[PDB]
Design a protein around this ligand. Structure first.
Ligand SMILES: OC[C@H]1O[C@@H](O[C@H]2[C@H](O)[C@@H](O)[C@H](O)O[C@@H]2CO)[C@H](O)[C@@H](O)[C@H]1O
Length: 148
């Protein structure tokens, strides 16, 4: 029902993904936003190079300034594509969360706490994702996977 569970990873976290992100796969991330968070991001990456920065197939970036939002994008050759902004964000400072990223054939479907949050169409074949990055101001209790 969940495997390869990592507990209380230090952030910034970079970790190799166990198996392939095929349709049906779930990535489950449970955590808590620190009272002073400005933003954090979950990146599904092709590799872990820092300079040059590895490509990010799916950058999921809750931001907490202003009214707060979530920005989703794809980084290729150190350049960002078209941003998809979601203004209805379930993330709050000092509040805990469960993020479920479901890999569908055509898109990612993201729900927080069991409620649908956003969709993001595949720009890179998800089969090429091999690394999970979590950066910014966030406390992660656990990361887990349920493949296929
Ligand atoms: O697109 C993801 C990418 O955004 C960068 O910041 C953008 C910002 O999202 C945009 O709304 C503002 O108007 O311009 C900035 C120019 O890049 C981030 O710096 C980056 O971390 C990613 O989150």
């Amino acid at each position: 029902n969940l495997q390869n569970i990592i507990y209380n990873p230090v952030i910034p976290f970079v970790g190799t993904i166990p198996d392939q992100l095929d349709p049906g796969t779930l990535i489950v991330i449970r955590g808590h936003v620190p009272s002073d968070a400005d933003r954090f991001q979950v990146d599904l990456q092709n590799g872990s190079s820092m300079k040059p920065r590895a490509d990010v197939a799916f950058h999921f970036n809750p931001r907490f300034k202003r009214a707060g939002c979530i920005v989703c994008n794809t980084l290729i050759n150190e350049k960002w594509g078209r941003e998809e902004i979601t203004y209805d964000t379930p993330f709050k400072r000092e509040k805990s969360f469960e993020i479920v990223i479901m890999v569908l054939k055509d898109k990612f479907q993201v729900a927080v706490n069991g409620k649908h949050t956003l969709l993001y169409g595949h720009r890179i074949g998800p089969e090429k994702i091999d690394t999970l990055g979590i950066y910014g101001k966030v406390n992660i209790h656990s990361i887990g996977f349920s493949f296929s």
